[PDB]
Design a protein around this ligand. Sequence first.
Ligand SMILES: Cn1cc(-c2nc3nccc(-c4ccc(CNC(=O)c5nc(C(C)(C)C)no5)c(F)c4)c3[nH]2)cn1
Length: 267
Amino acid sequence: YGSWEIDPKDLTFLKELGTGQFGVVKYGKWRGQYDVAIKMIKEGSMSEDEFIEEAKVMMNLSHEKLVQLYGVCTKQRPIFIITEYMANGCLLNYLREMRHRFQTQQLLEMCKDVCEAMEYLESKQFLHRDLAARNCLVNDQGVVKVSDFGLSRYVLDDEYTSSVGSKFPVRWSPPEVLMYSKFSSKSDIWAFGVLMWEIYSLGKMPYERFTNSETAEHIAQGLRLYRPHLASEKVYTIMYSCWHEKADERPTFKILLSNILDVMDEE
Ligand SMILES: Cn1cc(-c2nc3nccc(-c4ccc(CNC(=O)c5nc(C(C)(C)C)no5)c(F)c4)c3[nH]2)cn1
């Protein structure tokens, strides 16, 4: 009915893609020809009425490096979220497949793709709030795109929303987030630096030998993730700059984009 509204009868379900915070995600066709991913929102997992109002704004967030929101199926339950389909799945799983034998130029291009999406979001004053390789997707061309931006606000699960919760993204959070719940564009910057570390580590867990509690203490004492073996000193300088103790001293995504482009030219 509405601009944001998709008729579920227009969907053909073809395969299960995975399960996330809101349940199963399937691959399908819209009106027989258009590839889509269909989030089948499990009951009690989402602030549905609030998400519905926000979907209108989220649908207007259009950028080549952002996994596009096509619409919603709300005249029912489970409600569906219809997005752009990405053939190569989750960036985290993609990084961990050692068969790709990624060259450093490919790893930087992944950082660049994410940075371009993040600079676009930053320009619209829209926070991702859960930037990580697990929330990035890869298309059939190996292009990396930012997925599920701003959806964290509609998660009803306290294990995910509490900074002391089991599902909270502790390892991707700056000190001010863990200490005072101070979220800003600079908490996305911090998460982007960690994502750069995940890319250059080929999907290793940040602070792999620590628990969430020990990571929070480590980070609050001014200590940081160290240089991945595949990261040059210039690349490590960029990710490190995201982790300044003072949020205001962290770069913007526009500054990071210029830094990534300069390194691309250097290597
Ligand atoms: C083996 N394989 C898979 C593909 C795959 N392609 C895809 N294309 C588009 C989309 C998906 C896709 C996207 C997400 C999820 C699970 N997460 C959520 O739904 C969700 N988390 C959250 C926050 C962060 C806020 C908590 N918000 O939403 C998913 F399981 C699949 C895709 N999968 C290709 N191969």
